[PDB]
Structure 1
């Protein structure tokens, strides 16, 4: 039923299972070592993303689309790479890179052995760079939340959850099935997405980073949240982040999409900060 790209395909037999990394509602993945993925005969360890016993058709449609999305994006230091994809006789298995420390939100939450401010800027800098590569490839993430951004072993940040991604190169969905708190007003109300919306989500992502994994829009119910955005309630600055970042961070959250800064602008703005810290 599912055709196999020759370059991506990997034999089912070669791969070996490991203790499951996680079992989310979105998808199930099991850590595993796959040998000779590149053949160099190296038994690399790759997390595998796969379906649950009961899978929604949209999940089936989404994971497969997520696998396809990885092929288009070029290998980049920040975005999580796809090393090999399996579409054998058995159930579809996707092989991804393994990030030893888990997602960004959970990594900071476990460091409230300490996180110096320079590292926080560095963590922020890498995300901008990743988005910049995606912008060049015209891919829009649609999430950009700390909770699905894998931070790898030796602290190099990695973007993740490309299942929701679409290739940009307005009206295919109402921009539902996405976390509202991390979602842009333009997408929320008019159901269209653009690079700016990721930047707004990225603006929310910065609060996740600067609140040491803290949840955004504290004390506000999602139903209530529709109203504040129209009137302009933007969250106050996190303690650790310096004031200069806030003007940039707040600028990302804008009423009109055109005003919001593009990624090229953000990385360049961010590159200097690391230098003077």
Structure 2
């Protein structure tokens, strides 16, 4: 394991193809902090091919970092190395791993997370129906790609989708993602989680489909909190008895059918991401 408890240097293996030299990065304004790191805007030279600086997001350790946070940030970086380029994913761009603090460079999304983006645009240019379907389609396309790369996200939610300046949706926060014992799937927020993840301690692409269903509900409620009024301690009992969230007012019947299919108890009866892309493509085309 890499450890902060060294008196020489960093103990991270070199990976030249991802390394960016430090003079080619200028750190800028803070964007915020998460569980195991902070994010700052930066400009990076020659990492997307002309010496023009590109704005990126830099994830780094917090001032109150732990040794585990180092391990976690390295693991996140290593997962992202394994995920190829896709327009609807936040991709790794580079890293500064030698000769200084650990910096993980990822694509920048100027409008922040989808959940806050939606909530900020609640009626009281509005978000239209077409905008909502477009958001859902783009996330589905991202997830279809992830699944094809044999990657389970495990933490899909509106909070973990970012929005670019040009309103492109990019799936983010790969800290829990796995390349496909008793506490397996214990770090997954239960309101977004397929029941089988906890009851059977398995996780497949079809489990991610359940989460996508919850995300769809979040989109059409403009960032509503799932299962409002129901405590996490009561949730699985209600779900086992067949309760499902009600149709959002912004959702049409056809979209609500898609959403409810994603919450089939039986994973194999949920649609695949390839099927969801097809379904949402159809909706998006008719609405234009």
State the TM-score, normalized to the length of structure 1.
0.95
Match of 1:125 in 2: 137
SS in structure 2 of the partner of residue 20 of structure 1? strand
Change (3 A) 1:156 1:61: same
Alignment pair present for 1:15 and 2:25 = yes
Answer whether contact 1:12 1:88 (CA < 8 A) is retained.
Answer: no
Shift of 1:65: 1.5
Match of 1:74 in 2: 84
Shift of 1:58: 4.0
Answer whether contact 2:220 2:250 (CA < 8 A) is retained.
Answer: yes
- Distance, in Å, in 2 between the alignment partners of 1:119 and 1:206 is 13
Match of 1:52 in 2: 62
SS in structure 2 of the partner of residue 203 of structure 1? helix
Shift of 1:59: 3.0
Answer whether contact 1:174 1:190 (CA < 8 A) is retained.
Answer: no
Structure 1 runs (4+) greater than 6 angstroms displaced: none
Alignment pair present for 1:268 and 2:278 = yes
Alignment counterpart, residue 179 of structure 1, candidates 178, 189, 214:
189
Alignment pair present for 1:151 and 2:150 = no
Shift of 1:188: 2.1
Count of matched residue positions in the alignment of Structure 1 and Structure 2: 275
Correspondences of 1:224-235 after superposition (within 5 Å):
224-235=234-245
State the TM-score, normalized to the length of structure 2.
0.92
Shift of 1:39: 5.3
SS in structure 1 of the partner of residue 39 of structure 2? strand
Change (3 A) 1:118 1:201: same
SS in structure 2 of the partner of residue 198 of structure 1? helix
SS in structure 2 of the partner of residue 115 of structure 1? coil
Alignment pair present for 1:165 and 2:177 = yes
Alignment pair present for 1:116 and 2:128 = yes
Unmatched 5+ residue regions in structure 1? none
Alignment pair present for 1:213 and 2:226 = no
Match of 2:154 in 1: 142
Match of 1:2 in 2: 12
